[PDB]
């Protein structure tokens, strides 16, 4: 039905598109201008040690702080760690202003994000009979029961997949499936092995024209096997187990068919449930079935968490099953949001700060901003001459780092509107006056905007 467009399958440029990893050696020593980064040696070496701690499964509740000013690369190191670990290890990048809810207490969204940050891998098997039914032919028993009519000992089903068909002898108590689900000739079913009760998926596509109007879903023939003995790896986060044990998904009554029919409400979860789930996960690991994989809870903007949250974080980090907590703070001496009494470093309380491996982040040299400009320009595809690179580096040193990475898009638009293919000095000198920075904006705001009058701002 849905028409497919034959266009170009490109991607979009974010602020951290060029980051592809840390770019280390085989010994851990960082190397400049590798995998997107420029410089920032000690922070990348320390983050490589953090990545090794995560993949070595010795982390059981550590905590890592990323200090440093704004626009120096904390979130860049976070996305570098998330792309270095891969995809099969979880990564939950919440912010500080994302624990404040209106259905639960704000010391509960933290624990639910801990449970989102932990993964559990389960390897199991799947044995199913599969496919479209061709015959439903019974077989009369050898010794019929006296007092009854038909006595049927083995029920035969001919299942036809898209590769090969197969006759199947079954126990006769599949009949209660077939009458209840209304399985007929031409309906794909699957028969499991642990119970053996077939469930119809739908009418096949070969019988989509025997009638004219009587229509339902017309699912195709299962293009696969007829006897699946297929093994499955299955990744479930512990948040999903907490939700599925707290609020059950599918029930058969009125009030659970109103619970899924009304809006799902976040509810606080009692600690006995989490203790039981930890006690049973640590039993299935000891049986050697499920693997626990801890992840990263990158709490960005860690100075928005107030003092009522770090107290709960101490308890949650002292748990025997917990991921790493990579915080991200860009403040100096700051007032903690909850208790307006103590001026502490980074917005972090001094009791909580001793847990943290504090990684610094330094400002950039005035000859590395131009390398970041070259990498960002060859990421977007916007090519430009060397004097233009030097002018963008001049604006980067004198004003901001995030501002010289944003004079590349209007310069490229004005370049391909003026009639060229590459960006020159004239296009950036024209685009620097259509898009002012914060500094000249504050200069216009103070100098020209003298006071509140007719043609003035509202202070």
């Amino acid at each position: 039905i849905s028409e497919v467009r034959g266009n170009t399958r490109d991607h979009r440029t974010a602020a951290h598109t060029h980051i592809k990893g840390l770019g280390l050696n085989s010994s851990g020593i960082a190397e400049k201008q590798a995998a997107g980064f420029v410089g920032q040696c000690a922070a990348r070496e320390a983050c490589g040690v953090v990545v090794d701690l995560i993949k070595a499964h010795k982390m059981a509740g550590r905590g890592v702080l990323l200090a440093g000013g704004p626009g120096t690369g904390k979130t860049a190191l976070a996305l570098a760690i998330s792309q270095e670990l891969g995809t099969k290890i979880p990564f939950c990048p919440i912010t500080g202003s994302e624990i404040y809810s209106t259905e639960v207490k704000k010391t509960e969204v933290l624990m639910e994000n801990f449970r989102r940050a932990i993964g559990l891998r389960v390897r199991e098997t799947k044995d199913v009979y599969e496919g479209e039914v061709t015959e439903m032919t019974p077989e009369e028993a050898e010794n019929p029961l006296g007092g009854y009519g038909k006595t049927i000992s083995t029920l035969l089903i001919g299942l036809k997949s898209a590769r090969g068909q197969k006759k199947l002898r079954l126990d006769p108590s599949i009949y209660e499936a077939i009458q209840k689900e209304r399985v007929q000739v031409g309906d794909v079913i699957y028969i499991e092995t642990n119970t053996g009760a077939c469930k119809r998926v739908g009418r096949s596509d070969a019988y989509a024209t025997e009638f004219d109007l009587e229509a339902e879903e017309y699912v195709p023939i299962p293009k696969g096997e007829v006897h699946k003995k297929k093994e499955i790896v299955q990744d479930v986060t512990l948040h999903d187990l907490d939700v599925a044990n707290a609020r059950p998904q599918g029930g058969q009554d009125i009030i659970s068919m109103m619970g899924q029919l009304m809006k799902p409400k976040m509810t606080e979860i009692t600690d006995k449930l989490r203790m039981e789930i930890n006690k049973v996960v640590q039993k299935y690991i000891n049986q050697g079935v499920a693997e626990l994989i801890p992840g990263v809870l990158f709490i960005d903007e860690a100075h928005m968490l107030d003092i009522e949250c770090f107290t709960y974080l101490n308890k949650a980090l002292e748990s025997p099953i917990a991921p790493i907590v990579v915080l991200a703070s860009n403040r100096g001496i700051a007032t903690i949001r909850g208790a307006d009494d103590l001026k502490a470093a980074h917005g972090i309380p001094p009791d909580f700060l001793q847990r943290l491996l504090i990684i610094p982040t330094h400002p950039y040299e005035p000859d590395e901003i131009r390398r970041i400009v070259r990498i960002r320009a060859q990421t977007e595809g916007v090519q430009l001459t060397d004097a233009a690179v030097d002018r963008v580096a001049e604006h980067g040193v004198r004003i901001s780092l995030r501002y010289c990475l944003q004079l590349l898009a209007p310069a490229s638009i004005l370049a391909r509107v003026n009639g060229r293919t590459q960006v020159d000095v004239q296009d950036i000198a024209e685009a620097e006056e259509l898009f002012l920075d914060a500094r000249r904006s504050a200069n216009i705001l103070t100098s020209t905007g003298e006071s509140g009058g007719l043609h003035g701002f509202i202070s």
């Binding site: 979009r12 202003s97 898009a409 898009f435």
Partner: protein, 437 residues
């Protein structure tokens, strides 16, 4: 007919040249703001390209200068293809969902998913239900041109029984899903009954072929996919509002499947524009989330407006330029505006005259230009309607100097209301005491 002349009615698009980006002064309603309109044209030309994800464009300047005018010009000059979202900042402070999620939903609305398909539907008026109690049946349906007899097997006879279809209904069958949707009854059977029921609505007969197939271009947003997948019958929640904190795992699954649809060529992602009007009302607890939501691949090119000078930030107690924190102003780009010369004021009042179909003598237009220079735009534009109405009371076609001076005498500009307040302080409730004469 639910469309009346508001303040933003003469602005039919941005009004710049599409070739070389030259803002000619009097085009498509907007008048004489050449540098800000050129910068908005550059922003709009990097919106329609849709490659560069998650910028932020602040539009500063004094009040009554045209910051929402340029925003409505960018909204009109995109079409119905690329989305746009007019969200003032006070909409976020809700009592059912938090500020973070109600601001995430502002980002999830401004990204469309575009999918083209073929709808195999069948309109038709029922003539005679013929059920053969032997399972089989025959349905006779007609239109204004054709008439046909289609077979039925087992179960849609039961669907007809559950729908209670009589002779004279207007049924529609979606043959790709197979469910009867009774649209009502026809005007040819309004003569039949006398005391109708409640549910019956009358319709014209279907016209043309029975089997209608048509290629239709659906365009939904990501917020639609998020709210539909919230709960079971959750599609009515986005009309009603009965939704709350949607979990992050549902939005993660939905973004993964939208990336998968983009890989398989089913869907095309069209990024749009989020417009956060009066962004200075957001507290720091919202900018700390905007600074992270402008990082993903699925983030719209945010355009925001502001009025205030060096003011306090809500939620904290320290002054800052534009009412915004400086770690947020290091991230945005700022397009300043400027006040208007009288040569622009005269033709802006002329455009507001010809929009409201009010004729003005040139002396009245010069007087109204002087009033607009001495009081502002929002008071001068509010004197065209009043002068037209006072001319209508004394039965004159063209308004004059007398009607504009009458309108200036009756209603007060905000420049003289402050002198009226400070002239009589003992009766207005200042903070403590009233005299009451």
């Amino acid at each position: 007919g639910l469309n009346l002349i508001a303040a933003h009615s003469h602005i039919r698009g941005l009004g710049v040249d599409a070739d070389t980006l030259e803002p000619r002064p009097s085009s498509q309603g907007l008048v004489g703001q050449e540098k800000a309109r050129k910068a908005a044209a550059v922003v709009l030309e990097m919106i329609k390209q849709g490659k560069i994800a998650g910028r932020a464009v602040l539009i500063a300047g004094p009040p009554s200068t045209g910051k929402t005018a340029i925003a409505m010009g960018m909204a009109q000059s995109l079409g119905q293809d690329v989305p746009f979202t007019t969200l003032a900042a006070s909409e976020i402070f809700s009592l059912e969902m938090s500020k973070t999620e109600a601001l995430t939903q502002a980002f999830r609305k401004s990204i469309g998913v575009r999918i083209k398909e073929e709808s195999e539907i069948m309109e038709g008026e029922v003539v005679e239900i013929q059920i053969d109690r032997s399972k089989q049946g025959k349905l006779t349906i007609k239109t204004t041109d054709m008439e046909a007899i289609y077979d039925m097997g087992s179960k849609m006879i039961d669907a007809m029984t559950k729908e209670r279809v009589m002779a004279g209904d207007i049924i529609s069958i979606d043959k790709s899903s197979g469910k009867i949707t009774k649209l009502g009854r026809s005007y040819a059977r309004s003569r039949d009954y006398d005391a109708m029921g409640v549910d019956t609505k009358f319709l014209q007969c279907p016209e043309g072929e029975l089997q209608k197939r048509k290629e239709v271009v659906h365009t939904v947003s990501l917020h639609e996919i998020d709210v539909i997948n919230s709960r079971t019958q959750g599609f009515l929640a986005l009309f009603s509002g009965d939704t709350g904190e949607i979990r992050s795992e549902i939005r993660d699954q939905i973004n993964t499947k939208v990336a998968e649809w983009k890989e398989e060529g089913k869907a095309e992602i069209v990024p749009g524009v989020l417009f956060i009007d009066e962004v200075h009302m957001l507290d720091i607890e919202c900018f700390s989330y905007i600074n992270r939501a402008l990082e993903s691949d699925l983030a719209p090119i945010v355009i925001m407006a502001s009025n205030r000078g060096v003011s306090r930030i809500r939620g904290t107690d320290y002054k800052s330029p534009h009412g915004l924190p400086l770690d947020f102003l290091d991230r945005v780009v700022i397009i300043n505006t400027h006040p208007y010369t009288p040569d622009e004021l005269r033709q802006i009042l002329s455009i507001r005259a010809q929009e409201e179909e009010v004729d003005l003598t040139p002396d009245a237009l010069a007087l109204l230009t002087k009033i607009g220079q001495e009081a502002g735009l929002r008071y001068a534009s509010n004197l065209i309607t009043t002068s037209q109405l006072i001319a209508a009371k004394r039965r004159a076609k063209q308004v004059g100097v007398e009607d504009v001076q009458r309108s200036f005498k009756l209603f007060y500009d905000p420049a003289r209301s402050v002198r009226f307040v400070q002239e009589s302080e003992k009766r207005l409730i200042g903070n403590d005491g009233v005299v009451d004469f």
